[PDB]
Each structure stands twice: as structure tokens, then as C-alpha cells.
Design a protein around this ligand. Sequence first.
Ligand SMILES: [Zn+2]
Ligand SMILES: [Zn+2]
Ligand SMILES: [Zn+2]
Lengths: 193, 207, 252, 47
Amino acid sequence: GIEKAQEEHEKYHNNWRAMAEDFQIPQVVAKEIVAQCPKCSPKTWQMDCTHLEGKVIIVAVHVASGYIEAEVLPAETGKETAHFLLKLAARWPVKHLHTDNGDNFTSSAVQAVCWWAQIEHTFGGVVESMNHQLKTIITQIRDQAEKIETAVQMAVLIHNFKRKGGIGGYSAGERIIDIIASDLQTTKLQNQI
Amino acid sequence: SPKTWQMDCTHLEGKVIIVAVHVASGYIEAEVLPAETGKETAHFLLKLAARWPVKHLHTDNGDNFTSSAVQAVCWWAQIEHTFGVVESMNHQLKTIITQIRDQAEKIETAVQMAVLIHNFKRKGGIGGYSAGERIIDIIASDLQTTKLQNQISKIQNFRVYFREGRDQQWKGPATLIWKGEGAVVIQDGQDLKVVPRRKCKIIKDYG
Amino acid sequence: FLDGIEKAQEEHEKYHNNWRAMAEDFQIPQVVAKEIVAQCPKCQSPKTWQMDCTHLEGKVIIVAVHVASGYIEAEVLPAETGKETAHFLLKLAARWPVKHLHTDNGDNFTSSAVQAVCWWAQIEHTFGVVESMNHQLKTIITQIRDQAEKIETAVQMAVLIHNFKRKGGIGGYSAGERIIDIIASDLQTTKLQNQISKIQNFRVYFREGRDQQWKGPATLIWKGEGAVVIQDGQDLKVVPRRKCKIIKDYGR
Amino acid sequence: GFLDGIEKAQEEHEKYHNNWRAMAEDFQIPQVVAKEIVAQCPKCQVK
Ligand SMILES: [Zn+2]
Ligand SMILES: [Zn+2]
Ligand SMILES: [Zn+2]
């Protein structure tokens, strides 16, 4: 397996995650294989903010499964963004946060919450598709509720558990639960063996 | 039961906190309410129903738990609502709140940090798991059972055109059972047989 | 059966699902589910390609990218005249189903040869992703340049590494699996639409219970072995076969 | 072939409004295309 991984990286220069999945090697050997080349994540969340009918809607998307979590913000300050990030860290395990070079995400309160929750905060074609799909669902079920908050939460529910599309035919919640369960069993068997 | 949630409310520092607990694994989601009306209670129940699969809810005979807005949200999300652990979780949450009070300025920061500490930083139990690992494992096992029972027929909904010994005509569309590495098991006219891999064509045959 | 149809109608009224999810969950045939979807007033591309020309080490490379999945087919031209561009477009239209081409306002893209190729292959040509794919392809070309003697070998090996080795996206699939799944879904949609029209060219006279009279002409949806699904009064219902007369309808 | 027969049947039904069996026996087209020619007329009705 190790010779197959070395020949595959010498031929096509694969990343360490695909080699660890396809050749069944622990991740430290694949990391050293990629690090020894001269030519050369289930817990990553991307954040964004948008506007809709004068309100500010903050959207956090889990990337490897397509999971959504949205909220209505009364303002675009830093304390409310830090509170939403604290609630997101208190609900799901967050290890790597991806954002844009903004003003509210670059704040002392949000950096204090990131330090207390031990999250790697990084600044930099999936999130635009997620926001566009959320906008189409919001325009679909707008007339079933009065305020925009109930419409946002019902759009989150429909996007999470009522859209069984894609190649596998799986919704977002079942995908993120199966991914984190398989990653937990993989880390357990690697810590045991 | 893997899909039963219970709810309760309490007071702290002049505020009103509402705590919802997944019972089978001890998973706490808590929020700070600015009022005790039915609108924000149904809004919190809608956020809980949008984040996690809630199929059965158990509450008490309160004033905000008996509301037409809560009935409308439960009808829209197809929730079986019953009237009647959470006190022990409230005691644990208040002790953690008093433990790390000195790092939070407001009250909601201390509440959400206590929720994070109780969810991911208190490893106990029998196997030595936290609460998030327990709820993820329970829901994954139940979904694996139901999806297995559907995927058997989903893989049996295919068609196989096979070839037999010393006959140059492709036979009819027998039903696939299992596709091995070098052998294919098919069912043809209530007769199970095994053909090699180089003598079969597997189509879904839209038409 | 009828309980499943009424549950699917209430579910589509609430949440506005698609027809595949309802046909898999509620155990109804796909023609009835597509009928329920098509009767919604609030519920109403896999064959588009982009072309580009670039320069690399004194040669002229031409890249054609399938947009909906990111599928790159590249070639090396001897010159930048119109005839070799028309020949590459004819090869691309011969291997993959192309129905809409998106190009820029170049000179060799505006020629009688490209116009005759688009006329013979029936392709809608539109003059205005690709820069990002060109950046990724040129980084891969500069990554594995030393393993090839000429430039065309490095170009084809970079196309292979980009198509079948680099994995990403939501589920972690490559580009070839995405284009094959998208085209297969389009094929399933076209076959089901042909079956829907061929069944919907009929008419049904139905007779209600405790009445010896025939009612109005309801449109047939799905003809089963014991049950018959009809549409009447903007409503779907299931009538048994012993109370129905299926006749041909000439109503163009 | 009877493709010119189909064109002449369209012209003849546009003028005189024949029925389907008459055109199928005169112009020697099959009965399905003659019934479709009668079916496409908004004033006629196949009977
Ligand atoms: Zn390398
Ligand atoms: Zn609809
Ligand atoms: Zn006529």
C-alpha cells in the first residue's frame, strides 16, 4: 500500500486525503509523503452575510455535506456575529472557519470567541449556489407566513431535509451525520490500532 | 426513543432561559428569551425543528406552551406534542454558568459557553463519550437501518442481459441480485443462477 | 394508493418537493408524481460548452469546457486559422452531444467554416469559469512538464489528471462522474416525457358508484392492471377498471 | 411514396373538407395520417 501510494504520488501527485481514502493508509504517512515532494476536512464551515428586504441574513454552510444554518441579524456589528459564531460552535464541532476579508468578521470580540473556541480563522463556487438556492426557496414559500423570519427558518428546514437531490440521493442532514460518524469511527480505530 | 425532545424554562439574573434536551443522549440546546410570549417560544421551536430532526416533543402545561402559534408550528413541522432529567440538566447548566461567569460580560455569552462546555467538554458515561458523539451515533444507526431496508429494493430494481453457454443470442432482462468482482447473481423466472462478469450487461433501461 | 396520492398532494402543497423524492417515498409511479409537480402554479444547462484559445511555449492550445460540471477537452493546433477550429468543433460535436456553444468575438470563431460546421451540426452559436480552468490547467502543465518530451504529451496528461484525479465538490466526485450523472439524468427526463405524451393522448369515460350514468370525459394519467388514475375538474382520482371506458381522443 | 399524397390531402381538405376514409381510399395514404388530418381541422370532427 505504501509503495502504491508513493508510485501514485510520483505519477499524478494526489493529495493526502484521497490517498488515505483509496489506499487505506494512516494520515501521518500520507502527510509525510506529500511533504516530501519538491513540486508540492469534515469540520470546515464557511460564513457569509447577505441582504433581503432590509434585513441582514447571516449564513453558515458546512462544505463537505452542503449543510446550512441561517439566522436573522438586527445589525451588522461584531458582537452579534460573535454570538452567532459562539452558538454555531456550541451546537456543532467547528475546527476551521473560512470567511471573506470583511469588517464584522475582523473584530476583537469575534477573535476572542475564536480563541476561546479554538478555531482556525482563515480569510479568502459553492456558497453562491447555496445562497441562490436559499433565495429561490424563500421566494417559493414566502406567502405561507407573515414575517421574513418564519420564512427563513422554513426555507432552512426545506433545504435541509426536503431536497433529496444529487448523485447519491441524500439530504443534507443525513449526509453530515454520516460523514461525522464515519470520521469519528475512523479516528477511533486509528487511535486504537 | 431516538427522536424525542423535552423542553423547559427557568429564570436567571432577571432573564428567562429556555432549555430543550434530547433525552436519549443528553443534548442541550438553550436560548435566552426577551419575553415569555408564545411567538418567540414557537420561533425557538421552529429553529430547533430546522436544525435537528424532532419527531416527538414533550412539554409541561405552561402558559406559553399552550398557544396557537406553537400548534401551528407543530402542525407545519409534523410534530407530536405531548403534555406532562431536565431539572438535573438545568442544575448542571447553572453550576457551569457560575463556574465560568468571570469571563463573560453579558449573560448570553455565559449561557452559550455553558452549553458548549456541557455538550463537548464533559466526557463521562460508560464508554467515555461526550453528548455530541452520542447523539450523532444514535441518529446514524437509526438512519442506517431504514436506508438499508430501502436500498435492498433500490439495488434490485435493475435489469441484466446475460449470455449462456454455446448460444449467440442475448437473453431476456433478468433481475440483478448482487454484483461481485468476477460473478453476477441474477434471478430469472424464479430461478437463481450465477453468470461470469464477461457475459453480462447491466442496464437500468429507461423505457 | 389513493392515500399515498393524497399524502403526496399535501406534502407538495406544504414543502414543494420534486417528483423523484415523492415517487421514492410515497410509492407512487413517476408519471403521477410528475403530473402533481406539473399541476403546481408556483413550481413553474446540461448541453452547453464554452470554447477558448490560448498560447503556451510558442504553440496554440484550444480548450473546450463543459460548464455544468467542469469537463475539459483540449488540443494543440498547428495554426490559428478557421478551418482547424472548425475541425476541432466538429470532433467535439462528434464525440459529445453539443447543442449550445459559447465563444468570444475572435476572428477565427467568425468564419464560414465555423458557420457551416454549426449549421451541419445544428448548434446555437453565441458570442459573449474558463479563465479559472485555464489557470488550473496551466498550473498542472507547469507541475508535470519534466515528465514529457514534447508539449502535446504534457497537455494530454494534464487533461487526464484534471479529469480523473483531482476530486472535490460536495460529495467528493471528479469531473467525469459529474458529467456522466448529469447526462444520464437528462436522458431519463426525455424518456419519461415521451412516455407521458404517449399515455396522455387518450380519454376516459368513468361511471360513478350507485349511478348507471357515464360522467364527463376525464383525462387518463396512468393505466394500471386493476386501477385507473384520471384527472377531472383539476383533481386526481383513482377509479377501478370495471367502471371505465378508455377511448382514443382526437383533440388536437 | 405518398408524401405528395399527404400534401395533396392537406390541400384537398383545406378546400372541400373531406372525411378520413375518403382521402385514405383516394390518395392512398395510411389511415392514421388521414385521421390526423381530419383531427387537426378546427371545424371538422372525425366520426
Ligand atoms: Zn507531489
Ligand atoms: Zn410546487
Ligand atoms: Zn375540415
